[PDB]
């Protein structure tokens, strides 16, 4: 699978709390790290709508709690530019729990998923309902 992902505006820094968007049992997610982030003195790591993150679950069924997990961002509230020449934004921020290799722990996504996110992960595209 190719990994190109033309740049997207980042607005979801570390310490944000977002919805969980799937049927795995959790209700929210708490971002604590972002893969691929480098070094810069006072800067916070931040993620956009195709990246994989490390998160914990603050509410949901007890066996999912008190652990570090993997997640993938599917919707975001900050606007971003599409090369066709317009701007897009959702209402809320959502993500799903996955494997370190990007395989879901649940079996269904609830709401719409972004068209850029589905181009990078084939299982998420297969399990989606409406791609926008």
């Amino acid at each position: 699978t190719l990994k190109n992902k033309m740049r997207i505006t980042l607005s979801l820094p570390v310490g944000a709390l977002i919805n969980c968007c799937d049927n795995s049992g959790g209700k929210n997610l708490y971002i604590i790290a972002v893969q691929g982030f480098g070094s810069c003195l006072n800067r916070l790591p931040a993620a956009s709508l195709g990246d994989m993150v490390l998160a914990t679950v603050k509410k949901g069924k007890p066996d999912l709690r008190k652990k570090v997990l993997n997640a993938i961002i599917c919707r975001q509230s900050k606007a971003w530019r599409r090369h066709e020449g317009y701007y897009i934004y959702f209402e809320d921020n959502a993500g799903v729990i996955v494997n370190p290799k990007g395989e879901m722990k649940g079996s269904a996504i609830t709401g719409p998923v972004a068209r850029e996110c589905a181009e990078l992960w084939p299982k998420l595209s297969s399990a989606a309902s409406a791609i926008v």
């Binding site: 003195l41 090369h83 020449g85």
Partner: protein
């Protein structure tokens, strides 16, 4: 002791004496290397900045995510009225640098060229270039033979025509354009044919060419360290204010070093930028100079309501991809690359699908002024 945490330096020490420039005009510091196997040709030009707009274009990159999509890009417009060639100068090489033999002028010159030699032309007798045009041509030809025999570099003196723009200025801008190409004699022959004619901009450049730009940035005055160098901002509890650098240096190098950022003048700097691509060379004899194959609406480049802060463009122009330093009306200098490039982007040729001409005052909604009256119907 050592600093606790590392961070790269703030400014760039290569643009360092951040003082105001000597002039409006951008000066070429070095020219492209002469390839004596090409035919003689010009190397530079000059015009004025008008404004910006956007276009729609199709992509031809196999392997990219955008390989078959129409995309939007931003472009800049430069007004390019023709210049006039009025003189010849020849240099020769000495161990102290290039040196001049003589300058040779044309038989006639215009008044906007002569105004550039006067602080206040309106109260003068206007006696510049009045006795040295009656020189016999025999002396001129002897001087040209000497230039041919003893020199190694030619340049041509050219000037612009501000009367064909919406500018308030009437003095013409003067510059030298080096001529690369064949032998010295061929160079001299090439130049002499033009001593009183016009250069169109289309003679000097080609469609889909890559070009370098020289101009002077916008001026802002005195600006603080936070804005001038982008240093960190300091905590709100600080007693004498927070917009500064805390430590100027260690104790005992017992001075302030030149690398420390300080307050001072920002803007109005001289710059040279590389690799700006040409998208269209429009003319003034063409009525539909902003229409495409996919949009047959008859249009000129000027947006509805005039270019904001400039005026109307009714000469031939260049369309450049990207941005250029300077304000509106700032004179822009255009040089060829030092050596020609052969990359995948330098050779690729561009076909356009739409050029926007809606109003830039406010939020434009129509492409021509007839659509506006067609939409509303009769008014009161």
């Amino acid at each position: 002791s050592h600093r606790k945490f590392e961070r790269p330096r703030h400014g760039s020490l290569g643009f360092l004496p951040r003082k105001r420039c000597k002039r409006l005009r951008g000066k070429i510091r070095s020219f492209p290397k002469d390839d004596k196997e090409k035919p003689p040709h010009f190397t530079a030009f000059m015009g004025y900045k008008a404004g910006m707009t956007h276009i729609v274009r199709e992509v031809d990159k196999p392997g990219s995510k955008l390989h078959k999509k129409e995309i939007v890009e931003a472009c800049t417009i430069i007004e390019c009225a023709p210049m006039v060639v009025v003189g010849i100068v020849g240099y020769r090489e000495t161990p102290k640098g290039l040196r001049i033999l003589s300058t040779v002028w044309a038989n006639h010159v215009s008044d906007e060229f002569r105004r550039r030699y006067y602080k206040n032309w309106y109260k003068s007798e206007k006696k510049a270039f009045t006795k040295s045009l009656n020189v016999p041509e025999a002396t001129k030809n002897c001087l040209l033979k000497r230039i041919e025999k003893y020199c190694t570099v030619l340049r041509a003196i050219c000037h612009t025509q501000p009367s064909k723009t919406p500018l308030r200025m009437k003095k013409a801008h003067i510059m030298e354009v080096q001529i690369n190409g064949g032998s010295m004699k061929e160079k001299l022959e090439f130049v002499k044919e033009m001593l009183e004619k016009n250069l169109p901009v289309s003679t000097v450049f080609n469609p889909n060419e890559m070009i370098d730009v020289i101009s002077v940035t916008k001026g802002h005055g005195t600006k603080g360290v936070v804005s001038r160098y982008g240093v960190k901002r300091l905590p709100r509890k600080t007693h004498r204010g927070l917009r500064k650098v805390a430590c100027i240096g260690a104790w005992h190098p017992a001075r302030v070093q030149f690398q420390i950022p300080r307050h001072g003048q920002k803007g109005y700097f001289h710059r040279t930028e590389r690799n700006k691509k040409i998208y269209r060379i429009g003319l003034k004899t063409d009525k539909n100079s902003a229409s495409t194959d996919a949009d047959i609406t008859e249009k000129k480049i000027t947006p509805m309501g005039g270019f904001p802060h400039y005026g109307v463009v009714n000469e031939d122009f260049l369309l450049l991809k990207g941005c250029v330093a300077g304000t509106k009306k700032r004179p822009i200098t255009l040089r060829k690359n030092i050596v020609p490039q052969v990359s995948r982007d330098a050779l690729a040729q561009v076909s356009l699908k739409f050029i926007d001409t809606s109003s830039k005052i406010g939020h434009g909604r129509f492409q021509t002024s007839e659509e506006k009256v067609k939409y509303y119907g009769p008014l009161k």
